[PDB]
Amino acid sequence: YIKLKVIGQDSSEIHFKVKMTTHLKKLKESYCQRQGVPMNSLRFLFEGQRIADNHTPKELGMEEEDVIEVYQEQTGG
């Protein structure tokens, strides 16, 4: 497991415990749930590239205290 900070444009920093070999699906949906918006309404970046539902921290080389940047989608989903 690994702490990961999710940062929005307001500059809010919300902390998550995440398993190393588990789909980032969960993180992304849990964040959207926390914020009361539909998933597919937000996109999530790590090192300027979008996470995907199939991606895990196993791959991507994701570390402790690493940051993920979240943005609103044009469509808004």
Partner: protein
């Protein structure tokens, strides 16, 4: 509100994905980049004088949405006791004192489609048309049918 723009976008796509759209009963087009104005289209419901017709609806989202309703008007002229024959202004509760903040674009479009199939002549928007509906149903139908051909592609 960006809450209001994100919302409208979501409800726009909800109509896009709807069964009623895939059946071509309702549709919505985007007018402004900002989602403050839409254009709706409803089919003339079957077994009414509008049948065969398509009716465009100007939809404008005021700044106090969703606490006030969308401002809806017929662009397509139509002969109906609850719609102005001159302006397309609409008499319909959900656009007035029965608006509810959780109502969606889809809900509105379906209500208007049901409006076409179900008049309330004792609460008219067009008292001439409503008086005719009540006093001379047959002239009302022939006229509604000719307006539907002339103005609504029937």
């Amino acid at each position: 509100a960006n809450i209001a723009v994100q919302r409208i976008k979501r409800e726009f796509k909800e109509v896009l994905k709807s069964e009623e759209t895939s059946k071509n009963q309702i549709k919505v087009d985007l007018v402004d980049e900002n989602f403050t104005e839409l254009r709706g289209e409803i089919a003339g419901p079957p077994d009414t004088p509008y049948e065969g017709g398509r009716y465009q609806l100007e939809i404008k989202i005021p700044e106090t949405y969703p606490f006030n309703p969308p401002k809806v008007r017929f662009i397509t002229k139509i002969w109906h006791p609850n719609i102005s024959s001159v302006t397309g202004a609409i008499c319909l509760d959900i656009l007035k004192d029965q608006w509810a903040a959780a109502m969606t674009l889809r809900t509105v479009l379906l209500s208007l489609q049901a409006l076409l199939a179900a008049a309330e002549p004792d609460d008219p928007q067009d008292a001439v048309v409503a008086n005719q509906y009540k006093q001379n149903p047959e002239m009302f139908k022939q006229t509604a049918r000719l307006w539907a051909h002339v103005y609504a592609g029937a």
